[PDB]
Curated annotation (Swiss-Prot), chain A:
The gene is 59. Homododecamer. It is found in: Virion. Forms the portal vertex of the capsid. This portal plays critical roles in head assembly, genome packaging, neck/tail attachment, and genome ejection. The portal protein multimerizes as a single ring-shaped homododecamer arranged around a central channel. This is Probable portal protein. Disulfide bonds: none annotated. The lineage of its organism: Viruses, Duplodnaviria, Heunggongvirae, Uroviricota, Caudoviricetes.
Swiss-Prot record, chain B:
It comes from Enterobacteria phage N4. The lineage of its organism: Viruses, Duplodnaviria, Heunggongvirae, Uroviricota, Caudoviricetes. It is found in: Virion. This is Major capsid protein. Assembles, to form an icosahedral capsid with a T=9 symmetry, about 60 nm in diameter, and consisting of 535 capsid proteins. The chain holds residues 152 to 201 of 401 of the full protein.
Length: 51, 50
């Protein structure tokens, strides 16, 4: 019943490649990402208003 | 993940094929190559192949 006692929290958000490239040093393994296969249409769990 | 991905790809392929067949069946201006006048007449052998 207390948020401060929670062990973990997991969030799903939408980004593009330019957003990740805004801070290049922060992220690794960008070249292995499959941008076609991880579209919002593939993942049903994420709830969004995007067509 | 793999099962879900293949399921969704199948869905998109099916819907596109369904649209295409309706487009072909609802054509307004129809031309038959050669001397054919109906789908049964198209023939590849003769004086005038289709």
């Amino acid at each position: 019943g207390d948020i401060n006692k929670a062990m973990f929290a997991i969030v799903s958000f939408e980004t593009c490649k330019a957003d990740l490239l805004k801070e290049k040093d922060r992220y690794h393994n960008l070249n292995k990402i499959d941008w076609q296969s991880s579209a919002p249409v593939n993942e049903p769990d994420h709830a969004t208003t995007t067509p | 993940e793999h099962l879900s991905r293949e399921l969704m790809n199948g869905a998109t392929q099916i819907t596109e094929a369904v649209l295409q067949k309706d487009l072909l069946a609802a054509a307004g201006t129809v031309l038959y190559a050669g001397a054919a006048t109906s789908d049964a007449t198209i023939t590849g052998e003769g004086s005038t192949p289709s």
